[PDB]
Design a protein around this motif. Structure first.
Motif, PDB file in Angstrom:
ATOM      1  N   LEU A 327     116.906 -50.534-114.273  1.00 35.34           N
ATOM      2  CA  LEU A 327     117.621 -51.740-113.780  1.00 35.34           C
ATOM      3  C   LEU A 327     117.409 -52.873-114.761  1.00 35.34           C
ATOM      4  O   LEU A 327     118.125 -53.862-114.761  1.00 35.34           O
ATOM      5  CB  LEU A 327     117.151 -52.182-112.392  1.00 35.34           C
ATOM      6  CG  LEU A 327     117.371 -51.281-111.175  1.00 35.34           C
ATOM      7  CD1 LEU A 327     116.986 -52.035-109.908  1.00 35.34           C
ATOM      8  CD2 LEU A 327     118.806 -50.805-111.082  1.00 35.34           C
ATOM      9  N   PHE A 334     113.176 -58.586-109.111  1.00 37.25           N
ATOM     10  CA  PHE A 334     114.034 -57.726-108.343  1.00 37.25           C
ATOM     11  C   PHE A 334     113.745 -57.843-106.863  1.00 37.25           C
ATOM     12  O   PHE A 334     114.668 -57.898-106.064  1.00 37.25           O
ATOM     13  CB  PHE A 334     113.929 -56.259-108.812  1.00 37.25           C
ATOM     14  CG  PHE A 334     114.778 -55.340-108.045  1.00 37.25           C
ATOM     15  CD1 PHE A 334     116.175 -55.459-108.091  1.00 37.25           C
ATOM     16  CD2 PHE A 334     114.224 -54.397-107.195  1.00 37.25           C
ATOM     17  CE1 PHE A 334     116.969 -54.640-107.342  1.00 37.25           C
ATOM     18  CE2 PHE A 334     115.027 -53.557-106.447  1.00 37.25           C
ATOM     19  CZ  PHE A 334     116.409 -53.665-106.522  1.00 37.25           C
ATOM     20  N   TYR A 337     115.006 -61.207-105.498  1.00 41.10           N
ATOM     21  CA  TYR A 337     116.477 -61.099-105.429  1.00 41.10           C
ATOM     22  C   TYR A 337     116.932 -60.255-104.229  1.00 41.10           C
ATOM     23  O   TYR A 337     117.806 -60.631-103.456  1.00 41.10           O
ATOM     24  CB  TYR A 337     117.046 -60.528-106.754  1.00 41.10           C
ATOM     25  CG  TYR A 337     118.403 -59.897-106.612  1.00 41.10           C
ATOM     26  CD1 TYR A 337     119.561 -60.662-106.702  1.00 41.10           C
ATOM     27  CD2 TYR A 337     118.528 -58.543-106.327  1.00 41.10           C
ATOM     28  CE1 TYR A 337     120.816 -60.078-106.554  1.00 41.10           C
ATOM     29  CE2 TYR A 337     119.758 -57.953-106.176  1.00 41.10           C
ATOM     30  CZ  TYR A 337     120.898 -58.710-106.275  1.00 41.10           C
ATOM     31  OH  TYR A 337     122.118 -58.072-106.124  1.00 41.10           O
ATOM     32  N   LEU A 385     123.937 -56.449-108.354  1.00 43.12           N
ATOM     33  CA  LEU A 385     123.467 -56.827-109.674  1.00 43.12           C
ATOM     34  C   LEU A 385     124.700 -56.810-110.560  1.00 43.12           C
ATOM     35  O   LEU A 385     124.606 -56.877-111.790  1.00 43.12           O
ATOM     36  CB  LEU A 385     122.396 -55.877-110.199  1.00 43.12           C
ATOM     37  CG  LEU A 385     121.006 -56.091-109.611  1.00 43.12           C
ATOM     38  CD1 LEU A 385     120.052 -55.030-110.127  1.00 43.12           C
ATOM     39  CD2 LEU A 385     120.500 -57.507-109.940  1.00 43.12           C
TER      40      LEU A 385
END
Ligand SMILES: [Ca+2]
Ligand SMILES: [Ca+2]
Ligand SMILES: [Cl-]
Ligand SMILES: [Cl-]
Lengths: 386, 385
Positions: A327, A334, A337, A385
């Motif tokens: 990612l 992450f 988020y 994303l």
């Protein structure tokens, strides 16, 4: 099923996992389960409350007998009851033994990435962490045995905190692995503290090798630490046990537990632990199948729907360790988020050190419906994303 | 009476007080009561068990509010809620603070005779006990203030563990005494650890002066330790509270508690402590009535029937401190003898150090019928010497 693994227990307001959540947030971070405990445990707790007076308690012989019975039945590894010493928790027992068996500034060896509390208890007590980092290659972790031995052989390295099974990677070591680690420690006069808190949660057709089972050429150098807390969803019960074959080490650890104020049971620790360890076998059997089902769902779902992440093959624990390197985002970023975009709360790997910044840890000890919700959220988070 | 002070709770087999006793034996030694707990506290425990899952717990604001309301109502002394830090027990908190706030080899001051577990946690941790002994004269104890100060001012004396009220003697210090002790410690850069675990059990119209009430700047050198454990018969609950006005000292203490493994509540500590401190007032009121009646009986009976011993005058606690010096026997020997002859089990004073070898300690927190029995056994023991 004999027991309820479908409904999430309704917590009081001061729950870490479920307190101070925003609307529709889904916590899958901290290692406690969203299942009801075994009713056999509940029955023992209710009966104890009826005493209606909660003065001082001793640890009875029956406690240690229960511990030995459980290890015999579940692991074919029966410790001697005389080896056993009550402590109110695994990490507190480690803290006490750090202070008793090493000096300020001494190094204590771990195998990173590993349970973040090990760093806290080592560093908080003014000892220094040294790692023989696990080698991560082809989506599996292994030991660098030469590097481990070199470090153990260092004069200032006085103790090894060994996670068996290993959190967060979820690895129950082989017999040969555990024996080789004990042999290396004994060889270099390093105390081996084996944290076996996940040892009842091996999900494959394998079993743990408790440190206390090693040959007498090394057995005098080992301490095994167990507790019903992880297995039975009893983090707040504060019941654990150290298994220490060497009598002099055992006496000294026991004194250290009393000094720390962790050597005497609270009003439920004894009956509740005894009930878990004498009557919890059937409940555990069912839990393991719920967990296997959840891990099978998570693995299949992520493989098919989120090829950007990789759930590690693991054989133990209810925590999934997920490689998110593809990612191209630090795990702490992450997870923040993900929580903001989706309400899913999972653990960033960073605090486990090692290569943890490339990983997240996901708690799958919840009803299937929650796993489904969480997987969907994780997918939406990755998709978004962009 | 609204509450039950007549039935002795039936314990499980791992009870220290009742566990290994011969038929007929009457335990009046260890400091726990033979009274059922307040039903309000039981109700909260039952409610908590309904959760049927016992993961990790935070300490809610409601816990500190409860503590502060309790102190306000019962002692006319409200702490700031921000001053409060949970710990799993008073003795364990003292132990953590010994390690955090002193160095190995440092001296830690007590006032002998005093609770034996103070010596265990000082010496075990590799600190050295120093005592300014309480002076015993005319059947009363007093402080040798010049000696106390000389010791506090010694460089290696770094902490004082102050028992307020004082066990085993049962003395709730005056406001002036507590303020003076705090001043002496502050001036000499000594931390005052005030163990206030018997503070809710003042039996006279007097009340305790918590160390946290002392004026600034001495206030920045004190820690008050409280718990529902003695008050409510909850030793195994493992719930206590440190009250620490100095914010930096407070944060350090909190850290030390987490490091030792005594900073996280168990699965009953919070609801049960909250219940005790919010709803326990009426039960405590009734308890003090029974305790006063028990003490009044013991004093009347022993004055009339056993002039060879002397119950010292005390204003606090449910423990009687009884001078047996006229028997010409070491207290440990006398207690062994007494148990063999009559089945009464009381605490020899020896372990409290000081002049404790001349005293026995007797727990009167039991039904009146057990007190009547025990006093008779004592008489029987003393007269058959
Ligand atoms: Ca097989
Ligand atoms: Ca698809
Ligand atoms: Cl050692
Ligand atoms: Cl300090």
């Amino acid at each position: 099923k004999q027991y309820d693994f479908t409904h999430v227990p309704k917590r009081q307001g001061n729950s870490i996992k479920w307190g101070v959540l925003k609307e529709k947030e889904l916590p899958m971070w901290i290692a406690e389960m969203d299942f009801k405990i075994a009713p056999e445990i509940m029955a023992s707790m209710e009966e104890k409350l009826k005493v209606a007076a909660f003065g001082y308690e001793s640890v009875p012989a029956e406690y240690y007998k229960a511990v030995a019975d459980w290890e015999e039945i579940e692991h074919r590894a029966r410790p001697k009851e005389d080896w056993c010493v009550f402590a109110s928790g695994v990490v507190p027992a480690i803290s006490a033994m750090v202070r008793q068996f090493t000096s300020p500034g001494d190094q204590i060896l771990v195998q990173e990435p590993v349970y973040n509390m090990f760093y806290s208890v080592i560093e908080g007590n003014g000892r220094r962490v040294i790692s023989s980092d696990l080698i991560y290659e082809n989506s599996k972790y292994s030991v660098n045995w030469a590097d481990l031995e070199e470090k153990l052989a260092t004069p200032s390295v006085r103790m090894m905190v060994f996670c068996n099974p290993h959190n967060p990677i979820g690895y129950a070591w082989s017999e040969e692995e555990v024996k080789r680690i004990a042999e290396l420690c004994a060889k270099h006069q390093v105390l081996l503290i084996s944290d076996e808190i996940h040892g009842d949660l091996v999900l494959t057709d394998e079993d743990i090798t408790p440190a206390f089972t090693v040959d007498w050429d090394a057995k005098n150098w080992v301490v095994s630490l167990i507790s019903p807390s992880k297995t039975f969803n009893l983090a707040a019960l504060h019941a654990a046990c150290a298994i220490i074959p060497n009598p002099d080490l055992r006496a000294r650890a026991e004194e250290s537990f009393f000094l720390a104020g962790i050597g005497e049971p609270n009003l439920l620790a004894i009956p509740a632990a005894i009930a878990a360890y004498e009557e919890g076998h059937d409940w555990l059997r069912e839990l393991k199948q719920v967990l296997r089902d959840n891990f099978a769902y998570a693995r299949e779902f992520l493989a098919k729907e989120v090829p950007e992440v990789k759930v590690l093959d693991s054989n133990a624990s209810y925590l999934a360790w997920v490689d998110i390197s593809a990612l191209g985002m630090n795990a702490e970023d992450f997870c923040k988020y993900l929580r903001e975009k989706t309400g899913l709360i999972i653990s960033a790997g960073n605090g486990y050190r090692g290569n943890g910044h490339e990983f997240v840890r996901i708690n799958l000890a919840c009803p299937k419906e929650l796993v489904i919700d969480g997987m969907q959220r994780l997918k939406q988070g990755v998709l978004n994303l962009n």
